[PDB]
Design a protein around this nucleic acid. Sequence first.
RNA 1: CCAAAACCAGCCUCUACUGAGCAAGAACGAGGUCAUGGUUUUGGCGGAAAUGGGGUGCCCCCACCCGUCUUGAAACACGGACCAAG
RNA 2: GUCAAAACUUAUGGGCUCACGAACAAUGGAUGACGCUCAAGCCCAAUUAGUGCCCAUUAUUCCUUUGGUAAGGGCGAGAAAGUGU
RNA 3: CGAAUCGCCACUUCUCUCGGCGCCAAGUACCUUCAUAUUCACAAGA
Lengths: 149, 136, 113, 132, 202
Amino acid sequence: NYIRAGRLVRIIRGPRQDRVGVVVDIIDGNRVLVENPADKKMWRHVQNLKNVEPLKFSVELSRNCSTKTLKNVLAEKKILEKYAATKSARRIAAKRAFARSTDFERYQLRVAKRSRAFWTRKVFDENDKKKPVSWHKVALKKLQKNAKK
Amino acid sequence: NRSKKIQQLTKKTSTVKRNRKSPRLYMKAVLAGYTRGLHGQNKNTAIVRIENVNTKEDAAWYVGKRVCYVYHGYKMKRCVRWSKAPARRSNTRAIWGRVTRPHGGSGAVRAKFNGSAVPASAIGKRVRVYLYPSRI
Amino acid sequence: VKKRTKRFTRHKCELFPQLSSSWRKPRGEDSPVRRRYKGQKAMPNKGYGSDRKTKYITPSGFKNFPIHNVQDLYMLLMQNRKYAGVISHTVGAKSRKAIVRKAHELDVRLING
Amino acid sequence: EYTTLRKSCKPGTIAIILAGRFRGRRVVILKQLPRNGPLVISGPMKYNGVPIRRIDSRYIIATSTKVDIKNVDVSGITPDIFVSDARAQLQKKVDAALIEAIRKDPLGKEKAGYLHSVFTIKPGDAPHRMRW
Amino acid sequence: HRPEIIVVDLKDHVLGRAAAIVAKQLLLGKKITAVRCEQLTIAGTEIRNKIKYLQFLRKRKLSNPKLGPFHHRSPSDIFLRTVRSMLPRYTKRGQKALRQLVAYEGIPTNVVRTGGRVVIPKAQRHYCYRSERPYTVLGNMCKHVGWKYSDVVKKLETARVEKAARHHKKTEKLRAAWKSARKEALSKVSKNNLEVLKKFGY
RNA sequence: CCAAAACCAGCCUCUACUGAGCAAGAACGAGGUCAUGGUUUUGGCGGAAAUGGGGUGCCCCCACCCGUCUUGAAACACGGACCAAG
RNA sequence: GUCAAAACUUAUGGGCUCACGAACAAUGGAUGACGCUCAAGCCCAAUUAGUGCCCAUUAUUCCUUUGGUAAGGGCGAGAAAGUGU
RNA sequence: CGAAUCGCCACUUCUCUCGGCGCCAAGUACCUUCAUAUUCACAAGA
Ligand SMILES: [Mg+2]
Ligand SMILES: [Mg+2]
Ligand SMILES: [Mg+2]
């Protein structure tokens, strides 16, 4: 999706990793002035285009637009609050919670990733009745040979 | 005897493998080689490429961590609890070191193994860099 | 803890059976060893001198002192923690019986008792 | 008394054993010994099977998680102490106190289960990137 | 028993970057198994690279070509030579590492259905070539240089693909089960866990 | 004897001005370390153990045959099969 | 980039380039080799990024030696008026 | 014959342009064995 003023890029690899921010104004073809009132550290700055990943979001806006205009307009859409809603955003905050996590939270996760992986099988075993599975489907048909004997 | 194969199909309800035995609390490194220039190697300072360390600021995390080149001889020899722990008498042997400092901007670190060099056979081979002494 | 534990062998003693391993300083402009190219044998120098208070000290911790007869043992009576008598190779097994049961009575050490 | 034992390691904290017979075992740090001495972590053995026993601070990873076990009396842990009835009796008297101290906490059910946990450096796993 | 092999899938990788990264891992003890070396790319038109190879093939000992440089024409043998040129091929450390590499044209039935296939993102063609610049797929140039099995491999590659694809919808009912079974696992008794799964994105 | 941890010391690393910048100064905190010094502690090993030496092989690495006259020798320059006595 | 220690092929730097490109006619074959081409090339700048790293017989520091016709102090076993052991 | 190695799988193991699980109760309920193996020491276990 096209990069232009008002596009809502996601910074990738820099000091401001995950953070997003609207493309205030194009400079030339390899740079832009990113901005975003919602984060403390997304004061207007020159991101390289290599560094940003355009998002599907993009407020309508005019080049070299003043910042207070932006703390306005994005507020009237909540392009940001709308953005965090997406799995693409949650995945970024999700990995940003696991890396940020303490050891007991990782217990507190493994207990769930087993609590669920256990019930994934419990659901499946119940549903094992309906084929197929190597253990059940192979066997039901497998008996077909046994019945013939 | 396929009689037994039919019986086996009913009983299996569908499990999974689970790792429930002895944990490893060491990272798996590699003895990438001795520290060296174009002119040759310093056999008294090994380089150790720890898995998933990729970065220099991770490599810094590992400084001081004790490191092991475990291998084996062809006969048993005295080990740390040869008498207290007979169970432990392998012809398995181990050479210990310390991660000394990060090497390069990647995840590699420098390990001096005691006063001695680690043997050149160790190269390309599993060093095991332990999480201790702990800091964190 | 010694600087160098290896002998400083003569260059190319290994090829020529006649050459003793004992050191001779290399000469000849083109000697790889005196021109001290890095892959070559080393030459002895003042820098390999042993640490000077551990010098002459045998792993027993004693400085060896030659001994020939039972009277020599008293040369070591008062400094028996510093010197250890090494009985000369040519004293008889006869006399060594006498040096030895006396080097025992005096608490003086003997390297070859 | 004197203690340079680090701020991350405090009594009642959960703490991974990095070395020795009990690798990967989460273990509450019951107390530090009277001089700048090794910690006396305890399992409790009721959970992960770790006996009361000494461990050097260098050989554990003090997790941020803990328990307000000031209430527990670990006073019977003294250096002179360091399976006989006098000791089997000691932990039984302690683990039951230590184990209830774990119960008092909200989210005290996980910490019982959290201490049944065993740490393991699984492949692809990056402790140095970990926080604890 | 199988050793800890990792079967790199070399399709659409730059020849010499993949050969350089692989040549390093072999030294670090990885036991790699390159496949689809037919699919390695090279910068430039095939004519650029045929002429590079035919200048290679042009080199032989006059005294006795029999013992001269050997001009293997298999893309895989070409990748092994490329990867032995990048490791200490005369010391045993490197002579060893080179034998820890097993190149194949295509992906052979022993190596298929063995595990997931790795990739080298630093050696990806899209990562390396400027996209609109011409590029030489390797097994394509070497077909013109003497490799005789370029069509034997394509017939084989066609078969593993049509076969792997048949098994991909043989198992569609199965994968669909775990997808359904796992989604309804969240609805199960994992309550507090359902919030510890929401955080972290599960 | 091998280890490991600690302590102390050492050692090392990790405001000001200006119109957001510098040509700019320390502090707190923490880490590392004995191939640094002094303080033990704690374990492991104990006919054998242990350190050292020696021998043989390997590994990685380094390494052009010496003497010679010569500006220049690995030289496609000379002398050089072995050893003993001289 | 590998060989080769180091950018596990760093840059959240700029340009340029398609075919060569990287200080001092005849045995087949040489950017050192491979290979590289949004370079692993060239010019430029950089150092984690509009918020570096590697390698010396070098330097510094530590230990030891040796020399000083160098500077001082001193006179459980030792304490010698001493160039040199 | 003592060994070094230390994730598995027919949910990856097709193609062409967050794979699942495992990590100490077969499960989220901690029922429940672990000590003296006496604070590192090849995991004494696979
Ligand atoms: Mg001339
Ligand atoms: Mg390298
Ligand atoms: Mg073992």
